[PDB]
From a paper:
[name] catalyzes the conversion of benzoate to benzoyl-CoA in the metabolism of aromatic carboxylic acids. Its catalytic mechanism is shown as follows: benzoate firstly docks to the active site, where it orientates to allow the carboxylic group access to adenosine triphosphate (ATP) for the formation of an adenosine monophosphate (AMP) intermediate; coenzyme A (CoA) subsequently comes in to substitute the AMP-activated intermediate resulting in the formation of benzoyl-CoA. The solved structures show that the benzoate binding cavity is rather small and narrow, constituted by several bulky amino acid residues including Y228, G327, S328, T329, H333, and I334. With the purpose to allow acceptance of various bulkier substrates into the active site, a double mutant [name] and [name] was created.
The mutant was examined against a series of carboxylic acids. To our surprise, most of the tested carboxylic acids can be taken by the mutant to form corresponding CoA products as opposed to the wild type that cannot accept them. There is no significant conformational change between the wild type and the mutant as the root-mean-square deviation for the 394 Cα is about 0.3 Å. Superposition of these residues and ligands for the wild type and the mutant [name] reveals that the overall architecture is almost identical except that the volume of the substrate-binding pocket is increased by 96.7 Å3 in the mutant. Three protein crystal structures in an apo form and in complex with a 2-methylthiazole-5-carboxyl-AMP or 2-choloro-1,3-thiazole-5-carboxyl-AMP intermediate validated the engineering rationality and synthetic practicality of the modified enzyme. [name] that underwent structure-guided protein engineering has clearly exhibited an additional dimension on substrate tolerance in light of 13 novel carboxyl CoA derivatives synthesized herein.
Author numbering:
A (entry chain A), B (entry chain B): 6 to 523
The structure:
Amino acid sequence: VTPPPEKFNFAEHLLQTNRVRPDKTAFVDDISSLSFAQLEAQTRQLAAALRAIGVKREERVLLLMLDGTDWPVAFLGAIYAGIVPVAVNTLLTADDYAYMLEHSRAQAVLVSGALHPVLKAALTKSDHEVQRVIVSRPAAPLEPGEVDFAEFVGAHAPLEKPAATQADDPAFWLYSSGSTGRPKGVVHTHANPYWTSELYGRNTLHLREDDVCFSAAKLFFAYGLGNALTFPMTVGATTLLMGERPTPDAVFKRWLGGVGGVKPTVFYGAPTGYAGMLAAPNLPSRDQVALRLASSAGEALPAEIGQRFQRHFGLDIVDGIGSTEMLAAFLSNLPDRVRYGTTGWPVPGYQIELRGDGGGPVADGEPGDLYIHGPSSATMYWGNRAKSRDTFQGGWTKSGDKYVRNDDGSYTYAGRTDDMLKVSGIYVSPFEIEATLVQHPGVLEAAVVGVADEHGLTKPKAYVVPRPGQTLSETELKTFIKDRLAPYKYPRSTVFVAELPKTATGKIQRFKLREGVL
Amino acid sequence: VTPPPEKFNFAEHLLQTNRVRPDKTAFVDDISSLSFAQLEAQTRQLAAALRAIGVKREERVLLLMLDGTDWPVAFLGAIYAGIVPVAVNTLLTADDYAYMLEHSRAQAVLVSGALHPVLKAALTKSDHEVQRVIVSRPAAPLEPGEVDFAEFVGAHAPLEKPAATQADDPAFWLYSSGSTGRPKGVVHTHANPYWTSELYGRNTLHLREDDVCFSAAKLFFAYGLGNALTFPMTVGATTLLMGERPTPDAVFKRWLGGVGGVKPTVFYGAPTGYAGMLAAPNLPSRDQVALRLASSAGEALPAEIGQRFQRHFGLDIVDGIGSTEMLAAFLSNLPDRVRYGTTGWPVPGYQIELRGDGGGPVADGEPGDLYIHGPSSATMYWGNRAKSRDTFQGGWTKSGDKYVRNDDGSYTYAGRTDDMLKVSGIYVSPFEIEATLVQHPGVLEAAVVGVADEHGLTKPKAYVVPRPGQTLSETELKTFIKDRLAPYKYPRSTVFVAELPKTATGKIQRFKLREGVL
């Protein structure tokens, strides 16, 4: 792959790529569609609209939007103007967004109507710098200083030229959370999604123009941003977008061609979703679907899930591991080379190292800390030099995973170095769940560990010491955490215990709980 | 009142004041008591202990503690060492404390056991700098880095001398919320509580050594910090402290001498609490109590409440108004000169100015914005230069209240300039409540305004537009807000309306919601 030119605007790059196909559908959702021509027009009008309200090159805007045809307009329109969109999870709390508004110094917000109430709460409580709120598909009356997204776009003539950015300039941020502390602002450059889209989307998955791409992973996830925006636009594929939660039935409806007149040929999701679909009584037969490629990321794919999918559909699931920091997969199985129980082989263009307790080589078959040297690495965590130093060191990026290299050069996941769990393919901190549990008045102590379920998928498990003299049932605890935590964070079971194993010092010996001591 | 010397440590000042009375009870609560000599010992030992764990002069520590004998030890111990305690409301959420930890850069936390769960959650989610957590009255096992308050104090010999602070050096912070944005870190000097305790506690209230002081307002409130710490210690009075919620029954128990063998002679509370007590069927008769003085702050005192108190007890309620920024009352009725329906007269030592829309004078009987020139003003909002400039206007402090001056020189509250609500004597932003309500899926729009109850006391009232096609009941909304707002933020009622009154641009006509148009 040839490097991008040093003068490079990623949005203009994707627009230019598709000037050969102006009338092909770029994006389609339940209620709307954009050809590549329409996408370019709306992208450049939104770029002008943001400039017209005073947002300047290198300033940030918060992009808080459900998947839908407005999402790539917002993302690419900001980037075309040299404005940095901060693309964020749509399932967070008002306090999370308040932090992100202050930390990013966002100058405007592009928000789905369904998400306006949580954004409103975030605005009210924070010391933010938001000059304008642009609401895509409002679900309630607008306030002054608020404008409808379609009117905002339609009220401004398209920007005549993109900002004269360099390839290594920041282009967008994503946020990623560790086991403690605030979400970290992961800074990606214009070059980084070129590298992922060429090295992985094109050269590994072999996506092509006649594909129809559909990702259960939403666009704010690094994984979904490639799957359903940067990869398909790089090759001219058509992309199906879906705002609603990706239940098996919602996914099947689209596989069967229920939206946009198109049947997806490429699907992407997490192993948990593949397990849920395989368990579904109305799982489609392979003659009903047009899938030619099934991608997975976000947690290790249990071998039996892949084998069951392959037996049913005659298609493998192609498991690869990326991260927010590396943007897309750096280890992956191939469409025609799949070893279940492993994450496959290094993606060409990426160098992989396993390092031991002194930073040196580990022997084959032995676990080591995974480090990645590749051209798509984020540059830093914005405003956090200490965590940046720990992670981005001289061309290498520390993943926080442990891996084992097998004799065929494949890599087998061996756990984390930082207590984080990957549940439904999404990062969950056990410490957050514990801190929620101990706020119930009947809970004295709580410890949360990851346990593999009947399909080998890790779910949280809570061990709770009740306060003596209080009655506390499993159902009341379930009720307590229902609206306090997002559903993927729910402990799969709770065990009430009389005490927790602690060192002579008071630290919970969580390994004894994973070993089943209680 | 003689100014404090330029070299001045407020904690040393209060300790030195009471060396004449070492064996008199300084503080007593339900389970413990401290004489003035015991208080001095523990104060100076805690000061040494904080220095030993590496907290330096001018660094902050978070003081998150229920009222009890350990509270003045924590507050005065920090100040004696030159460490700045940040004394905070005990009813807030983990999100609230996470921000306070980050903004104050607190280096340690002194926390009541009952508040350890919410602190634990705040520590886990925040980018804090907390090195050690000191737990007063632990209610669960300690974690590493955590130490019992009594053990911590007991492990260190008393510091020999106070830090060599200046009268105008920062001594402590309180946090003050506005109608939007983050709570503001109000910075008070060593001199400031000297001035309030001399000008108001001694020279206006005439507190004296044989008083027993008891405040329904907790110690983290500027009002309570004077009532039940700086004022009584200035004159050698004994203070009764109570950790639990100040219900009528809990207050009455203490009035009648149920704790510490002492009957309070001076009571302080909010008009809402006085109204609740006067309605109670078990209101004590005046021969049963030792009250000689009844102080009120936090919201305007309806004349019917004061008249009813006076008819029953033969005591007036002495209403004054202070602020977090001015630390104690700058307008007040006097013990023997009360005009109900007003906040009385300027406290000698404070200059009062009412200013109109152009900053000039206003005629008697006309409302103006209230400004205070007095020696107890905070110096700044830490880290917020813009709001500091709008508020601390060269020697004058803007209150954000409107007031009318009457012909006899008294002052009558005329409303806020900033839509804040004073409910149960406590600041509540209606915009915060509104933003919580609209996050219910059945709520389309909401507006919260202040409406008088049957005692003439302002409570929040919610006007809610339900979402069409959803079933939403007052009962369901009541259950929703139960656990996401503190009880004093509960709307007294909720009216469901088809539509809210708005201007041509969509802005809610909140005055007509108070004017009753719906």
